[PDB]
Design a protein around this nucleic acid. Structure first.
Ligand code: ZN
Ligand code: ZN
Ligand code: ZN
Ligand code: ZN
Lengths: 72, 74
DNA sequence: CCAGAACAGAGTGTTCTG
DNA sequence: TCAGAACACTCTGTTCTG
């Protein structure tokens, strides 16, 4: 019931990992797209519902470390 | 040499709300003071604020504005 | 149930003005 | 001079569709 990325209420298993709908589309957009993501911190940034917009670099790292896969 | 924003280090357009700043930090500060927002640092509150990363942490950005002396009083 | 599309909002940064 | 209004943009998030 809890997104393994941001801790928000999960909508199901997306791309191999239990996640919220916001993290689902964020991950796909991050993989397929082109951005400039740069951590302003130490790359330990806290990712939760309120702060997940703060550091997409760390959020995307968490997605990957959680094992999210587009071909899953 | 161009003038430098004391908040994010971008090119400064002049002195805004008491401090030499870029236009983006000018309008960011006004909106932060007047508005209701959720600003919580995801870091240690030491976050780097520059032109590229200034959008990352409005909490640290606002802190820098205040520490630089920005105010609406004059 | 889930992927992707369609739709919509938050926050930002610029130009324009007196 | 600098403060304010307002538009357009990016990144984001929810509802809809197959
Ligand atoms: Zn999530
Ligand atoms: Zn980070
Ligand atoms: Zn600035
Ligand atoms: Zn911060």
């Amino acid at each position: 019931k809890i997104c393994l990325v941001c801790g928000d209420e999960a909508s199901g298993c997306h791309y191999g990992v239990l996640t919220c709908g916001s993290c689902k589309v964020f991950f796909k957009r991050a993989v397929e797209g082109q951005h400039n993501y740069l951590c302003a911190g130490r790359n330990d940034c806290i990712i939760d519902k309120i702060r997940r917009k703060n550091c997409p670099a760390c959020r995307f790292r968490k997605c990957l470390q959680a094992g999210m896969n587009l071909e899953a």
